[PDB]
């Protein structure tokens, strides 16, 4: 068959009910994150082939970076509560991993202020019970999926994507067979 068990993807032994749809998995710590998201851009390049009604969603992960990968899983929570993802992602990746000006949590909230949220809103939110719940709600995803490593994609709670199985020749080539493997998942 053109997709294939074990190639393009793999099949969790114990499938997630109730599971987000499409999820993805990833740190601001993890350099091959860095690449997915900012370089191939894998998520958007997913969200174009996507069907009507299907999310997307990101969970940060804790287990790089230590105390400051925790801070930034809290910081992810704070984004999606307040629905700023899109304003943070990319200056929490080059603060992290560019240019290394983030090294606290505080350099972290540093981003948020400069891309606009309002101090006080960002420390009520940091220290809500909200998003303590969002932290314990991705780690616990983590969990759910047997997770590994990052950066990881799941659709369904049932399927597991495999870039390793894919064609790497080309990155252009390697970016459109993920986002046509997640679409196909998405109606299997
Ligand atoms: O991070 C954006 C960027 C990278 C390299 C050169 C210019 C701009
Ligand atoms: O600042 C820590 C870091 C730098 C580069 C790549 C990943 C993580
Ligand atoms: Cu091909």
């Not at 053109?2 to 710590?29: H, I, N, R």
């Not at 009507?52 to 287990?63: L, P």
């Not at 870039?163 to 459109?176: A, K, L």
Request: proline share 4%; hydrophobic share 40%; net charge negative.
């Amino acid at each position: 068959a053109q997709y294939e068990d074990g190639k393009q993807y793999t099949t969790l032994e114990k499938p997630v009910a109730g599971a987000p749809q499409v999820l993805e998995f990833f740190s601001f710590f993890c350099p091959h994150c860095y690449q997915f998201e900012e370089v191939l851009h894998i998520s958007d390049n997913v969200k174009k082939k996507l069907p009507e009604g299907v999310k997307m969603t990101k969970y940060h992960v804790n287990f790089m970076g230590g105390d400051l990968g925790k801070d930034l899983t809290q910081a992810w929570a704070v984004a999606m509560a307040l629905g700023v993802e899109d304003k943070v992602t990319v200056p929490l990746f080059e603060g992290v991993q560019k240019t290394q000006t983030i090294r606290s949590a505080s350099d972290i909230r540093d981003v948020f202020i400069n891309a606009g949220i309002k101090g006080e809103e960002y420390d009520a939110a940091w220290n809500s019970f909200v998003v303590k719940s969002l932290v314990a709600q991705q780690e616990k995803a983590a969990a759910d999926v047997q997770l590994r490593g990052v950066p990881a994609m799941f659709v369904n709670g049932k399927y597991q994507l495999n870039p390793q199985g894919m064609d790497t020749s080309n990155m252009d080539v390697f970016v459109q067979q993920y986002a046509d493997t997640v679409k196909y998942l998405s109606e299997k």
